[PDB]
């Protein structure tokens, strides 16, 4: 797919050359990324703007998906 897994070219978790994870880290930068690995689904990645449901990570991705009341 793309060739840049991270957005920061100064991040050690993702090779600046291929902007991708150099080591065996499941993620270089992101909200669901913990210890450079895929945390777990239903992970709090953000808060709800109002009062419905908090943000929960997929656990298999590094970026947190929108699980609030918008989309």
From Swiss-Prot:
It comes from the Eukaryota. Disulfide bonds join 4-19, 6-14, 13-36, 27-33, 32-57, 45-64. A motif (Cell attachment site) lies at residues 49-51. Residues 1-65 form the Disintegrin domain. Inhibits platelet aggregation induced by ADP, thrombin, platelet-activating factor and collagen. Acts by inhibiting fibrinogen interaction with platelet receptors alpha-IIb/beta-3 (ITGA2B/ITGB3). This is Disintegrin rhodostomin. It comes from Calloselasma rhodostoma (Malayan pit viper). The chain holds residues 408 to 472 of 478 of the full protein.
């Amino acid at each position: 797919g793309k060739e840049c897994d991270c957005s920061s070219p100064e991040n050690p978790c993702c090779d600046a050359a291929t902007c991708k994870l150099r080591p065996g880290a499941q993620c270089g930068e992101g909200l669901c990324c913990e210890q450079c690995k895929f945390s777990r689904a239903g992970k709090i990645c953000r808060i709800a703007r109002g009062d419905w449901n908090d943000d929960r990570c997929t656990g298999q991705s590094a970026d947190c998906p929108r699980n609030g009341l918008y989309g």
